Amino acid sequence: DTKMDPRDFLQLLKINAEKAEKNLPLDQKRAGMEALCERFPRAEGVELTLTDLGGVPCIRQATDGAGAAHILYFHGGGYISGSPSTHLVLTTQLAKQSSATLWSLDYRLAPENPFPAAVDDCVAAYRALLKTAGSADRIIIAGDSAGGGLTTASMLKAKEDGLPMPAGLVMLSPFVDLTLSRWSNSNLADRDFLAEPDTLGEMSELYVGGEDRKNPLISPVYADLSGLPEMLIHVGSEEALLSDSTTLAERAGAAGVSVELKIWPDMPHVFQMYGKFVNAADISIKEICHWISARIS
């Protein structure tokens, strides 16, 4: 089974970023993702049911053998784009390999629904999943990029709303500091062909709206993370957002949260989307599934 050399795959990404249409209308940018991400391979045997959680739509994903494990999954794409469909590549492999039922949430997006819309849908969805699952102990919250951020932030809100914390949190290249100001944002920008460093400002500004970027529910790095459940963070080396993950780990760590972080050589932003090309991607996926399933009881 054939793979790119990680470095050659960065060269492919570099080309893609170079040729990117600079001011792509957001609605065209969204259809472009839907169209490309459709040609990525879905995990065989994983069925997809179109449905809802607390009346927020989601695509539910499982084989014919799923145990009683559950994953609440929040796709990424900077709060302004992405949907469950784009992230099937990834979410169906997590479902299949965990033997869990994954619920991939279609949270309201910005700019048409600014913060706190997405955070509200996430908490609303978890509320409902507890009913369906029966216990918090059987739920992992999981997400990439903006969704990795949502995975902490929704859990900070739910805890304040008095809901029971779930079994663990999985973040892939979390986006958790929208000040965009730490070491990696200056020092690795030139290495990140996916994150959109040069625009992330207004990427974020659409979702932020009027709010404070250090609002703890916008940027969970500034929050009070105490009481949160076990975290697992995977981030690639080639990331403008690397310091978001080392900072999250630092601040959560200091708040008494168990934290496992793993940084992958030569991998780009949310490299787990690209198993077709790089073997690290499947290894990360498989590590994620081992962890999910070890502690979901």
Add this chain to the structure above:
Amino acid sequence: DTKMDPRDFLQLLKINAEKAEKNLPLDQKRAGMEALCERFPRAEGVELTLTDLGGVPCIRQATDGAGAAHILYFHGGGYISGSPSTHLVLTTQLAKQSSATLWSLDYRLAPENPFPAAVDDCVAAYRALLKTAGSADRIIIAGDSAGGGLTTASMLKAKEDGLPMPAGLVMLSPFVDLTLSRWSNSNLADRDFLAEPDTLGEMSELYVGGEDRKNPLISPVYADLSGLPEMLIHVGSEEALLSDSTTLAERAGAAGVSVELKIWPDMPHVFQMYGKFVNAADISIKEICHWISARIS
């Protein structure tokens, strides 16, 4: 069998910190670390051979049942104290649970011998261990506090000098930024009743002494960390030097080094010393050994 609640063990550490003499003579501090440490249990069946690696004294440690893996260990103590004997408690466990032969180096201390003495000793030992082990791929380099600093530093020098790289680096609460300036240094100071933030300043001067605190071989956080082998870092929440772990992870990952970092809730500096008292120490040791004994293949 019996363990303390981690928060209770922290209170026991607070009390020792409160009621310790303000300026003990360093020969007495060393003598008294020695006397207290003889009290902690050592793994049953671990034979203690007094030997050398390339002229540097060491205690070699192993069971009768040991495979062909070697662990080259550097103890902590601020570059000014500690010894293979004081760490028997920790290293005999590393040896037994990893089926390895561990060589706990008696590298040279300061202020008798300042930077670069301990580094050249570590390198010399490694060089010598390459011949005894027959291959770099059966060696792990491990170490705590300054032992952790030197496990990085020694390999940077080993790399400069053209020596192959080992199968991996393990670091327990590594001391890797002698500038002492980062977030945990001030935030978490008062929660740290082992690393002794208030003295660490002038303590470590004995090692540096005229040298620059950002010498890559003194504070590897400032190094070109390219081409170093895979890293496993463990550390506790209650650590003035927590940002050493997260920061080394930042920079090592961005230099393209594999890095896995776990941070342990309510654990103090080098908690793996306290299996007798807290349960998380036995678990961390267990995981470290799994890590170790799975790179050897």
